[PDB]
Amino acid sequence: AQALNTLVKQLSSNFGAISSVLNDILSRLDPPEAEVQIDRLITGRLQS
Amino acid sequence: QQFGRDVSDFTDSVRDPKTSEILDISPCAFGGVSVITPGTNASSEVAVL
Ligand SMILES: *[C@@H]1O[C@H](CO)[C@@H](O[C@@H]2O[C@H](CO)[C@@H](O[C@@H]3O[C@H](CO)[C@@H](O)[C@H](O[C@H]4O[C@H](CO)[C@@H](O)[C@H](O)[C@@H]4O)[C@@H]3O)[C@H](O)[C@H]2NC(C)=O)[C@H](O)[C@H]1NC(C)=O
Numbered sequence: 385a386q387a388l389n390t391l392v393k394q395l396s397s398n399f400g401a402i403s404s405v406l407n408d409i410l411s412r413l414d415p416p417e418a419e420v421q422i423d424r425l426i427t428g429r430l431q432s
Numbered sequence: 433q434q435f436g437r438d439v440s441d442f443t444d445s446v447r448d449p450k451t452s453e454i455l456d457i458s459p460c461a462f463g464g465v466s467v468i469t470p471g472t473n474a475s476s477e478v479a480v481l
């Protein structure tokens with residue numbers, strides 16, 4: 385349970401360091417090249 | 433209140449901006465697809481779970 389609690393906390397732990405929600409980085413930042421930032425975000429979540 | 437969240441950071445409840453209704457949000461549908469076979473040599477008809 386403490387492991388799964390830690391896994392939930394990984395989603396709140398933002399990794400790419402400028403975003404909080406994927407909806408936000410779609411809105412706040414532009415589509416055609418700020419998608420580099422979420423790849424940074426997803427790969428830490430991948431390793432997590 | 434406007435809208436609530438669970439133990440996680442996902443929106444649990446929501447309140448109607450027009451009618452002020454106690455609503456709550458559930459995820460749509462997902463899960464695993466599991467295939468049961470009696471083996472290709474024996475038969476060729478499958479069943480899913
Ligand atoms: C935002 O605006 C919407 C309207 O666009 C409004 O929703 C309305 O809420 C009221 C009350 O919550 C509803 O009115 C009821 O309607 C039924 C049938 O239409 C009537 O029988 C009801 O009458 C009873 O209550 C009256 C008021 O006390 C009494 O005069 C009467 O004798 C009865 O006791 C009542 O009028 C209405 O159906 C909705 N309409 C819609 C489209 O949803 C909402 O309240 C507004 N919200 C805010 C925050 O302003």
Ligand SMILES: *[C@@H]1O[C@H](CO)[C@@H](O)[C@H](O)[C@H]1NC(C)=O
Nearest residue numbers: 469470471472473474475476
């Ligand atoms: C396939 O099933 C038949 C049953 O009649 C068996 O004789 C055969 O050896 C099986 N094939 C293999 C590769 O084992």
